[PDB]
Amino acid sequence: IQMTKKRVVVTGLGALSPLGNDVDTSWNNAINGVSGIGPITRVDAEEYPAKVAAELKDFNVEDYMDKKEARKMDRFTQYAVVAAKMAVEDADLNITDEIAPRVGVWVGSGIGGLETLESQFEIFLTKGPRRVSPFFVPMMIPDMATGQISIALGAKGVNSCTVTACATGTNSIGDAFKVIQRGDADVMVTGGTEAPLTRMSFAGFSANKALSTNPDPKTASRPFDKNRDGFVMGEGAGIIVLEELEHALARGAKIYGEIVGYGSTGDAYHITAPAQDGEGGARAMQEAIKDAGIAPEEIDYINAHGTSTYYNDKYETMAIKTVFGEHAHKLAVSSTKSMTGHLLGAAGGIEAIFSILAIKEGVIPPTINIQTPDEECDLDYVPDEARRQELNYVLSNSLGFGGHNATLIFKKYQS
Amino acid sequence: GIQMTKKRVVVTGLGALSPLGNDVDTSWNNAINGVSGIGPITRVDAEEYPAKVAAELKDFNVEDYMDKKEARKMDRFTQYAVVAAKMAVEDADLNITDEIAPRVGVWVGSGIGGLETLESQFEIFLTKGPRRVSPFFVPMMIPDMATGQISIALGAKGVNSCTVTACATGTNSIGDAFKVIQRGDADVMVTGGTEAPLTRMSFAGFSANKALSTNPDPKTASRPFDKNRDGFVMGEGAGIIVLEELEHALARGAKIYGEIVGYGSTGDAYHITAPAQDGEGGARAMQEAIKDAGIAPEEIDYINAHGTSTYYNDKYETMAIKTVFGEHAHKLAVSSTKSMTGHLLGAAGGIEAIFSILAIKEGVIPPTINIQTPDEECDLDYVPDEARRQELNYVLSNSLGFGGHNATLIFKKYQS
Numbered sequence: 001i002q003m004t005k006k007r008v009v010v011t012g013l014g015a016l017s018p019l020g021n022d023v024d025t026s027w028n029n030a031i032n033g034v035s036g037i038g039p040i041t042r043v044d045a046e047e048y049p050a051k052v053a054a055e056l057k058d059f060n061v062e063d064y065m066d067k068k069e070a071r072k073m074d075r076f077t078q079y080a081v082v083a084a085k086m087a088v089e090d091a092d093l094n095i096t097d098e099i100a101p102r103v104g105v106w107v108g109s110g111i112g113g114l115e116t117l118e119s120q121f122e123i124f125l126t127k128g129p130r131r132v133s134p135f136f137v138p139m140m141i142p143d144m145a146t147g148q149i150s151i152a153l154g155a156k157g158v159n160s161c162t163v164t165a166c167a168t169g170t171n172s173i174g175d176a177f178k179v180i181q182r183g184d185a186d187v188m189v190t191g192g193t194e195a196p197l198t199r200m201s202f203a204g205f206s207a208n209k210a211l212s213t214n215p216d217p218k219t220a221s222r223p224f225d226k227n228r229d230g231f232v233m234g235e236g237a238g239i240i241v242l243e244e245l246e247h248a249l250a251r252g253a254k255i256y257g258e259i260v261g262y263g264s265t266g267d268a269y270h271i272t273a274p275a276q277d278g279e280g281g282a283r284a285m286q287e288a289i290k291d292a293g294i295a296p297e298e299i300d301y302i303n304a305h306g307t308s309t310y311y312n313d314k315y316e317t318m319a320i321k322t323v324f325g326e327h328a329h330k331l332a333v334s335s336t337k338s339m340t341g342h343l344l345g346a347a348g349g350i351e352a353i354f355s356i357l358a359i360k361e362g363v364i365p366p367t368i369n370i371q372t373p374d375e376e377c378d379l380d381y382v383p384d385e386a387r388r389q390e391l392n393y394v395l396s397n398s399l400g401f402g403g404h405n406a407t408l409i410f411k412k413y414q415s
Numbered sequence: 416g417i418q419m420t421k422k423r424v425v426v427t428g429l430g431a432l433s434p435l436g437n438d439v440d441t442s443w444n445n446a447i448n449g450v451s452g453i454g455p456i457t458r459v460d461a462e463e464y465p466a467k468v469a470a471e472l473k474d475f476n477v478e479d480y481m482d483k484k485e486a487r488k489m490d491r492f493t494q495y496a497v498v499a500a501k502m503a504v505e506d507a508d509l510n511i512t513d514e515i516a517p518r519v520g521v522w523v524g525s526g527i528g529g530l531e532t533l534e535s536q537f538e539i540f541l542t543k544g545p546r547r548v549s550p551f552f553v554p555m556m557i558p559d560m561a562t563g564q565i566s567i568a569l570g571a572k573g574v575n576s577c578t579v580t581a582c583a584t585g586t587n588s589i590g591d592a593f594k595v596i597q598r599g600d601a602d603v604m605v606t607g608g609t610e611a612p613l614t615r616m617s618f619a620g621f622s623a624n625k626a627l628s629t630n631p632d633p634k635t636a637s638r639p640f641d642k643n644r645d646g647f648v649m650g651e652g653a654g655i656i657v658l659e660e661l662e663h664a665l666a667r668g669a670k671i672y673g674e675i676v677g678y679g680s681t682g683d684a685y686h687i688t689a690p691a692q693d694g695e696g697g698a699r700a701m702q703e704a705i706k707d708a709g710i711a712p713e714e715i716d717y718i719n720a721h722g723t724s725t726y727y728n729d730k731y732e733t734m735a736i737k738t739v740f741g742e743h744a745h746k747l748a749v750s751s752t753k754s755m756t757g758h759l760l761g762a763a764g765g766i767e768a769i770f771s772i773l774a775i776k777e778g779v780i781p782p783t784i785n786i787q788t789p790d791e792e793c794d795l796d797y798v799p800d801e802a803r804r805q806e807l808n809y810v811l812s813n814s815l816g817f818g819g820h821n822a823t824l825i826f827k828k829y830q831s
C-alpha cells in the first residue's frame with residue numbers, strides 16, 4: 001500500500017491582529033514597520049509589572065454577527081470565526097452540500113476561553129454553582145473555535161484542534177497540510193486564535209517573568225536587541241485556506257503559494273526552559289527541510305520565533321547557525337513580533353500569513369526596535385525597514401512550553 | 416526522489432489509570448467481570464451540585480510511581496498521563512536510547528488540562544492578589560503539558576503534539592499518531608488521552624449544561640442505551656498506548672497486541688453541543704475509517720460505542736450504526752464500557768482504544784452493564800450484563816465531542 005502525496009496550495013487568508021482587522025491592513029502596517037504595541041486597556045495594568053500589550057484596534061464583534069451570537073462566544077472564538085469567514089470569502093470558496101464533507105477545519109488555541117472561565121468561576125464563588133452559565137463548558141474549550149468555524153462555514157470534513165502552547169498555529173497548519181497531502185480533505189481552513197489578554201494570563205506570565213516590564217511601548221518588544229527583557233503579549237487570529245492543487249486549479253482559485261514542509265520535535269528537557277543552543281528547534285527546521293526535499297541553502301527568509309526574550313532569541317540564532325552553517329549569514333531573518341507582539345497560540349497563524357505574503361509580494365517585513373546590537377545575536381534581522389526581494393522559499397519557526405518545536409516551509413507557486 | 420510506501424502500525428504497549436484499576440490488567444479484568452467504578456463523589460463537596468456520583472480512581476497515590484519532587488509541579492491530569500505513559504513504555508519493553516530518541520514521539524491529548532490548578536490559582540489571585548500566583552501556574556495548566564511531561568520523563572524527542580477535541584480527544588490523538596507513523600515521521604508514538612475533570616467548575620459547568628446524570632444511585636446512574644438514561648457520570652484517568660512501525664517492532668522482538676488500520680474524522684457543522692440528527696456525522700466518520708482500513712463494513716465484529724448514557728447521543732449513535740452497517744448492524748456486537756468506567760471525557764478514547772485492542776487480543780467482548788429498561792429506539796445487541804467470548808478480527812471505536820467532532824478508529828487482529 002502506497003501513500004497519496006497531493007500538492008497543497010494557499011488559496012485564502014483571513015486575519016485579526018494588533019496591526020489591523022484584516023490581512024491587507026495587517027500586512028501593509030507590518031511592511032511599513034508600524035507598531036501595534038501600546039498601554040494595556042483590556043485589564044487593570046496597575047496590578048501587574050507589565051504595562052504594555054498589543055491589542056486589536058477598534059474591533060467590534062457586532063459588525064460581524066448579532067449580539068446574541070457574540071454573547072455565546074469567548075473572544076478567542078469570535079476572532080477565529082471572523083478570520084475564518086474572511087479567509088473563505090478571500091478564497092472565493094462556495095462550500096456546497098456536494099463539497100462540504102471534503103472541507104475541513106483545523107484551528108488551534110493555546111488556552112481557549114480563559115476570560116469565560118475566569119468570569120464563570122468568579123460567578124461560581126460569589127453566586128453559587130446554579131448561577132453558572134449553561135454555555136460555560138462549550139464556550140471555554142479550545143476546540144470550540146474549530147467547532148464554531150465549521151458551523152459558520154458548513155464545513156463537514158476533517159475536524160480537529162491542536163493545542164501546543166506558542167507552537168499552536170504552526171502545528172495546526174502543518175497538521176491540516178498533512179491531511180490534504182494524504183488525500184483526506186480537499187480544503188482545510190486552518191491556523192490559530194488567541195484572546196490571552198486576561199487577569200490570569202497577565203498574572204501567570206508576570207509570575208514566571210516571561211513578560212517585558214518596560215513601560216515604554218516604543219522599545220518594549222525588541223527581538224534580538226541586547227536590551228530585550230521579555231515578550232509583549234498580543235491577541236488575534238491568523239487563518240488560511242489550504243487546498244489540494246488540482247481542486248484549486250479546476251475552480252479557478254487564486255494561489256498565494258505552496259506549503260511544502262513541516263517539522264515537529266520535542267526538546268524532552270524542561271517544562272518552560274528551551275533546550276540549550278535550541279537543539280530541538282534546529283532538529284525541527286531540519287525535519288521541515290527534509291520534508292520539503294530541499295537543501296538548507298534554498299531558504300531565503302526565516303520568519304523567526306523572535307519573542308524579545310533573552311534565551312529564546314539567543315538559542316534561535318544558535319539553531320539557525322547549526323542548520324544553515326555558512327548560509328546562516330546569507331539569509332534574511334525577521335521577527336514580526338517586534339510589531340504585533342506575541343500572539344501565543346495565534347502567533348503561528350499570523351506568521352504563516354506574513355510568510356506566504358512575503359513570497360507573493362516579494363517583500364520581507366522588518367524587525368523594528370533594534371537599537372543596541374547583541375554580539376550573540378549577529379545575523380541579518382532586516383532591521384527597521386522592509387526589504388524588496390524575490391523569495392523562493394520561506395521558513396516559519398515556533399516553539400512552546402513543554403519543549404514543542406514546530407517549523408513550516410512555504411514555496412513560491414510554480415505550475 | 417522520495418519514499419512512498421505506507422508503514423504498517425502496531426500496538427506494542429498499553430498503560431492505564433481508570434476508575435476500574437490503577438493498571439491495564441486490573442481495569443480490563445474488572446471491565447470483563449462487569450464491575451462498576453461508580454460511587455458517591457469524594458473529590459469535591461457534592462452538597463451544592465445536583466450530580467451526586469462520579470467514577471474516581473481508587474487508592475491512587477502519585478507517590479507510588481514517582482518522587483514527591485517530580486509530582487509537586489503536576490496537575491492531576493499530567494500525573495495520570497506520566498504514570499500511564501511510563502506503564503505503557505515499561506509494558507512495551509522499549510529502551511529509548513539517545514540513538515532512537517528523535518524517532519520516538521508523543522501525541523497525548525486532554526479535553527481541559529489543568530482545570531483544578533487554574534481554579535486554585537485564580538482563587539489565590541482573587542484573595543491574595545496577582546503577585547501570589549505561582550510561576551508554575553501557566554505550564555501546569557496547559558493541556559499540552561501532559562505531552563510535555565511525558566516526553567521529559569521518557570526522553571522522547573520525536574513528533575510532539577496534543578489534540579484537544581472534547582470527548583473525541585483520545586481517539587483523535589491516537590489517530591493523529593497513527594498517521595505520523597504511517598507517513599514515516601516517527602518509528603514509535605506514545606499516544607492517548609488524559610483527564611482529571613472531577614473539579615468544582617466541571618461539576619458546576621456540566622450541571623448547568625444539564626449534561627450530568629442527577630441520579631443519586633451509583634447502581635443505576637450510568638446506563639447507556641437504557642430507556643431511563645439521564646446524562647453521563649463523570650470519570651477521570653488516562654489511557655496511553657505505544658504505537659510502533661511494524662518492521663521496527665519485529666526487529667526488536669516486541670510483543671504485538673494488534674494493528675491500527677483505520678481512522679476517520681468529520682464535523683457535524685450543526686450545533687455547539689447537540690449532535691446532528693440521526694448521527695449523520697458519526698456515520699460519515701465510521702465510513703471514512705472503514706475506507707481507510709480498506710475493508711467492507713461487514714468485516715467489523717465489535718463496536719466499542721461512545722454510549723455516554725445521554726438521551727440524544729445513545730439514540731443517534733444507534734441510528735448511525737444502522738446507516739453504516741445496514742443488515743450487518745443487528746449482526747455485530749455493540750458495547751459501552753462507560754456503563755462501568757463512567758465518562759472519561761478527553762481520556763475516554765484512550766481507555767476505550769485499550770479495551771478495543773484487548774478485546775481482539777483476548778477474544779472477549781466487555782459488556783454494557785445496568786440496562787434494565789430496553790429502549791425501542793436503542794434495539795441493537797449491546798452485550799448486556801455479561802462479557803462474551805468471541806474471536807474478533809476487527810474492532811471499531813467511536814467518539815464524539817461538543818462542537819460536532821466525530822472520530823473513529825479501527826483495530827485489527829495482527830497477522831504477519
Ligand SMILES: *[C@@](O)(CC(N)=O)C(=O)CC/C=C/C/C=C/C
Nearest residue numbers: 110111165166196201399400401
Ligand atoms: C509560549 O510557549 C511562550 C513561548 N515560549 O514562546 C507559551 O507559553 C504559550 C502558552 C499558552 C498560553 C495561553 C495563556 C495562558 C495563561
Ligand SMILES: *[C@@](O)(CC(N)=O)C(=O)CC/C=C/C/C=C/C
Nearest residue numbers: 526527581582617760815816817
Ligand atoms: C464531551 O464532548 C461530551 C460528549 N458529547 O460526549 C464533552 O463535553 C467534553 C468537553 C469537555 C472536556 C473537559 C471539560 C471539562 C469542564
Ligand SMILES: [Cl-]
Nearest residue numbers: 489490493555
Ligand atoms: Cl500539569
Ligand code: NA
Nearest residue numbers: 110164165557
Ligand atoms: Na497551550
Ligand code: NA
Nearest residue numbers: 431438439502
Ligand atoms: Na497500566
Ligand code: NA
Nearest residue numbers: 611612613651
Ligand atoms: Na479528576
